[PDB]
């Protein structure tokens, strides 16, 4: 993606009803800090999910160790809060060639203060004035009270510890709902072999062959007199496959 927001207004994308491409995640290998939880990262290729929450933001190259489930520091204190019991992966890399610009990058922001620690996964877009001392400022700035938000200072003149990370966090769950988002397996077609099979969820066991019976386009199955599943069409490459 081309534009991640900051951590005071981080973007959240509920993702379900699709399939996971978890392979190239590991094959990317341009990513600085890439850690996972729940069960092992090699194991998560197939072990799949009801409903995932993909939420991303941009933080500093020093504060990213604050991003860990159950730590302290500013980003996990007032900006974005991982829960006490967490499953997902923290994916973190540098985007110094994009974000930090000469002439100064000050697009990005964060919240530096709030009158309590932050509840887990709940953003804070309320940019009203907090009153640290008892003197009421009441919306306008003043004494004993500060502004809530602050920028980062990004330029490529920064050192390596001050480089912007585009941290995307993947969070997972499990419910009475089915595993709507789930990883693989397209299996090569076998002709004339006794072979167990699944097509589009249709399951059976037969001998798949080339067949000249001619479907109408929208159709899926064929069937015989007996309400057996006689002939099916290969979804990936349309062809009429008998089932004996």
């Amino acid at each position: 993606a081309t534009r991640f927001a900051s951590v005071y207004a981080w973007n959240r994308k509920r993702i379900s009803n699709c399939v996971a491409d978890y392979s190239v995640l590991y094959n990317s290998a341009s990513f600085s800090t890439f850690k996972c939880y729940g069960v092992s990262p090699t194991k998560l290729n197939d072990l799949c999910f009801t409903n995932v929450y993909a939420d991303s933001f941009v933080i500093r190259g020093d504060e990213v160790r604050q991003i860990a489930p159950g730590q302290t520091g500013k980003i996990a204190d007032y900006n974005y809060k991982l829960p006490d019991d967490f499953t997902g992966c923290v994916i973190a890399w540098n985007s110094n060639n994009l974000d930090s610009k000469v002439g100064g990058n000050y697009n990005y922001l964060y919240r530096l203060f709030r009158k309590s620690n932050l509840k887990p996964f709940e953003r804070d877009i309320s940019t009203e004035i907090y009153q640290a001392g008892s003197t009421p400022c009441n919306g306008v700035e003043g004494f004993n009270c500060y502004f809530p938000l602050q920028s980062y200072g990004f330029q490529p003149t920064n050192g390596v510890g001050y480089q912007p990370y585009r941290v995307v966090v993947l969070s997972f769950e499990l419910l009475h709902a089915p595993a709507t988002v789930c990883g693989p397996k397209s299996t090569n077609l076998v002709k004339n072999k006794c072979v167990n099979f699944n097509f589009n969820g249709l399951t059976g066991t037969g001998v798949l062959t080339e067949s000249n019976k001619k479907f109408l386009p929208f159709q899926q199955f064929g069937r015989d007199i007996a309400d057996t599943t006689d002939a099916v069409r290969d979804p990936q490459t349309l062809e009429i496959l008998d089932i004996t």
Partner: antibody, heavy 118, light 108 residues
Framework: QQLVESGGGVVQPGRSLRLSCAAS????????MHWVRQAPGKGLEWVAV????????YYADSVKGRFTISRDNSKNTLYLQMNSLRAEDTAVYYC????????????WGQGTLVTVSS | GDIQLTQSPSSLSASVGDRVTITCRAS??????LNWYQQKPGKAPKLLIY???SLQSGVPSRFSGSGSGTDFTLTISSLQPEDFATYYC?????????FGQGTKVEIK
């Protein structure tokens, strides 16, 4: 990034003249905004605040003329109507912002002349 | 009542390479809430120092702020031919905000 102002002009005393000032680059919405006054040869005198993040309006009691201030947040614009005029207010106005130890957002409009004279 | 400011001196005609200390004094004890501005007459007031002790982007350390409480200091150093303009201090402690009367640094 940028602030634009409504047109100044010559207005008879006792009248009213709404002041429009629209933002650009970043929104008005998350911040406050101010108005200040500069008479020719005189120092910069603060006039009034706006505070969108709740809602509150503070005026200078030095020039306490019920110069009313409110918003058009969705246009990133701000409206202060010049009420109960008097000739020494003939000056240039600025749309303002104060770095309150946290930000560096002090952005200033181009300046337009309000004139109070018959 | 209001908070009075005291900007001294209200002008200082200066020369090349000086180190001018434009003082802004306060009627109350203000923590650090004071600023500084560049104004050539007719321009927009370009902010110089925020919180009385911190520099600003685009403005090098030829300007340098310090002070707290009542006493605030504009530390102009190695005075440049573009720095000769009308300047200002600024409270943000209470409401109302007042600004100083200005100090015009100008070529001798």
């Amino acid at each position: 990034q940028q602030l634009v102002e409504s047109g100044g002009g010559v207005v008879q005393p006792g009248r009213s003249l709404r002041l429009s000032c629209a933002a650009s680059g970043f929104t008005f919405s998350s911040y406050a905004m101010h108005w200040v006054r500069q008479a020719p040869g005189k120092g910069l005198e603060w006039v009034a605040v706006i505070s969108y993040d709740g809602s509150n309006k503070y005026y200078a009691d030095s020039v306490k003329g019920r110069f009313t201030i409110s918003r058009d947040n969705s246009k990133n614009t701000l409206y202060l109507q010049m009420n109960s005029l008097r000739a020494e207010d003939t000056a240039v106005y600025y749309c303002a912002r104060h770095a309150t130890l946290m930000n560096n957002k002090d952005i200033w409009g181009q300046g337009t002349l309000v004139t109070v004279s018959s | 009542g209001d908070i009075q400011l005291t900007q001294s001196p209200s002008s200082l005609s200066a020369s090349v390479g000086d180190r001018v200390t434009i003082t802004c004094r306060a009627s109350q004890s203000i923590s650090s809430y004071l600023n500084w501005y560049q104004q050539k007459p007719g321009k927009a007031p370009k902010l110089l120092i925020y919180a009385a002790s911190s520099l600003q982007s685009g403005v090098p350390s030829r300007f340098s702020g310090s002070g707290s409480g009542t006493d605030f200091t504009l530390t102009i150093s190695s005075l440049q031919p573009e720095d000769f303009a009308t300047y200002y201090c600024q409270q943000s402690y209470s409401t109302p905000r007042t600004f100083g009367q200005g100090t015009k640094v100008e070529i001798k």
